[PDB]
Design a protein around this ligand. Structure first.
Ligand SMILES: Cn1c(-c2ccccc2)c(C2CCCCC2)c2sc(C(=O)O)cc21
Ligand SMILES: [Mn+2]
Ligand SMILES: [Mn+2]
Length: 512
């Protein structure tokens, strides 16, 4: 079946959007190009490898017990800036347990229990994201109304937060902080006698997810020991929402119909990760890969196994790809065997190595800095809700580029504007935090360890990547950042207190 059908009505913005300050932001103007790419017929043919892996996943899922959340619990766990309901209340009313919201949520719940067939309405919007130099079109986001979204937590929050780690174990990527993720990847790599690894990412993954895939996911959830109302709600959600439904634009027009994964539902991440794990584990068996270990984060897969030799390895990957494709998930770019862990990129990132103060080798997670730099650039001139700059500084604190460029430039600006003490909203790991810049040393220490303030002797390859990207983008070279940092550090130190703590920890590297 067609992943989507379209009426011709346009995907419309609900606010002024911005396409420029090179660096661009996606807008609804490009929605059409995305629509075209994401619209196609799915062919899927399952085989015994698939059935066998599924069986094993269900056996694990059958050891999980999950509860319903009360309306109140689901209200409190609703994010503060999520889109308001069409029924007269918003997130803040949900979070503060307003009778309007609570009564509507209860009525949505009752409807889900009493009707398991009527397709539920969704809104479709174009995502506004910043990229750098062609242009990629806007990604689409499909979500139901706020009341429905609270009900999804009621039925499934306890499931999505407990089940995936049980079914997928160490392969469930979302359990890992950056350093833990590296630790898993390095230990896996070092465990193989002659390691080979590869990344795979599916072309339009959400569009490739079929009705059957979504029903198989539901059948995994129903293996859990659940309350009878939960079972009914999960069924109803699956039939009325997850498998598909009508799409409405921001102006209330009907845009069409969805027969694939909606991107804006509670189960998107868990379900995509489970479905990718299922197809990829079965594809590892088809390909006959030896001593396979997988890491999955949605449709971002890394596989590390024992090499069977160069040509053998190249042929097995084609076999893996062929299996993935029969299962509905062809790659954007064909996977390539890698024999150096540093060269495997997944979730836009890769493992690299540096040295701590003692000279000990320390592995850490990095990435190509072009997008982070471009987003930081945007945020110097505009301003937004996520403050990706700050998020990158935190998640990529041990990297040469976050330390030399992002930390420097941003403290430079905070100092100049006297806003060291002003908290900033920052979206990280799906949550919105209010972060004070002076709190960074503690945050980084907790997330990455003290060695993050002491890494040196970066790998040549990583240093040259940073240098190249700066050259490509016309940003000053590393020597200038070091000079700037020495100045930033002196200034911080001059202020004493916590400002000095920042200078000392964040900018220890810039000292002579
Ligand atoms: C060009 N440029 C950029 C930049 C612009 C577009 C995309 C990425 C980085 C930047 C970004 C500014 C925000 C932090 C990362 C670098 C800077 S700083 C600078 C200077 O002369 O001091 C020049 C630039
Ligand atoms: Mn993909
Ligand atoms: Mn992906």
């Amino acid at each position: 079946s067609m992943s989507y059908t379209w009426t011709g009505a346009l995907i419309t913005p609900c606010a002024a959007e911005e396409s420029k300050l090179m660096v661009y932001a996606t807008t609804s103007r490009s929605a059409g190009l995305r629509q075209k790419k994401v619209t196609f017929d799915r062919l899927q043919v399952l085989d015994d490898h698939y059935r066998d892996v599924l069986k094993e996943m269900k056996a694990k899922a059958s050891t999980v017990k999950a509860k319903l959340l009360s309306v109140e619990e689901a209200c409190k766990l609703t994010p503060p800036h999520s889109a308001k309901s069409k029924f007269g209340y918003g997130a803040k009313d949900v979070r503060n347990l307003s009778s309007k919201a609570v009564n509507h949520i209860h009525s949505v719940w009752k409807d889900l229990l009493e009707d398991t067939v009527t397709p539920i309405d969704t809104t479709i919007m174009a995502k506004n994201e910043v990229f750098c130099v062609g242009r990629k079109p806007a990604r689409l986001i499909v979500f139901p109304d706020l009341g429905v979204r609270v009900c999804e937590k009621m039925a499934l929050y306890d499931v999505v937060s407990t089940l995936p780690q049980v079914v997928m174990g160490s392969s469930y990527g979302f359990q890992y902080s950056p350093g833990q993720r590296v630790e898993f990847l390095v230990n896996t790599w070092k465990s193989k006698k002659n390691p080979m690894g590869f990344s795979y990412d599916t072309r339009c993954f959400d569009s490739t997810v079929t009705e059957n895939d979504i029903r198989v996911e539901e059948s995994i959830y129903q293996c859990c020991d659940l309350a009878p109302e939960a079972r009914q709600a999960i069924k109803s959600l699956t039939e009325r929402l997850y498998i598909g439904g009508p799409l409405t634009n921001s102006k209330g027009q009907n845009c069409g119909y969805r027969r694939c994964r909606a991107s804006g539902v509670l189960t998107t991440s868990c379900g995509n990760t489970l479905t990718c794990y299922l197809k990829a584990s079965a594809a590892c068996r088809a390909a006959k890969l030896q001593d396979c270990t997988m890491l999955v984060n949605g449709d971002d897969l890394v596989v590390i196994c024992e090499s069977a030799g160069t040509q053998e390895d190249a042929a097995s990957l084609r076999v893996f790809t062929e299996a993935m494709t029969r299962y509905s998930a062809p790659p954007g770019d064909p996977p390539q065997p890698e024999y150096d862990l540093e060269l495997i990129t997944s979730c836009s990132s890769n493992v690299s190595v540096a040295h701590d103060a003692s000279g000990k080798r320390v592995y850490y997670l990095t990435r190509d800095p072009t997008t982070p730099l471009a987003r930081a650039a945007w945020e110097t001139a505009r301003h937004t809700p996520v403050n990706s700059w700050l998020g990158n500084i935190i998640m990529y604190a041990p990297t040469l580029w976050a330390r030399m460029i992002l930390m420097t430039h941003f403290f430079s600006i905070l100092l100049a504007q006297e806003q060291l003490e002003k908290a900033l909203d920052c979206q990280i790991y799906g949550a919105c935090y209010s972060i004070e810049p002076l709190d960074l040393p503690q945050i980084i220490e907790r997330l990455h360890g003290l060695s993050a303030f002491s890494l040196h002797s970066y790998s040549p390859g990583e240093i040259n990547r940073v240098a190249s990207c700066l050259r490509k983008l016309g940003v000053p070279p590393l020597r200038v950042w070091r000079h700037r940092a020495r100045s930033v550090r002196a200034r911080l130190l001059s202020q004493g207190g916590r400002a000095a703590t920042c200078g000392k920890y964040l900018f220890n590297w810039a000292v002579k």
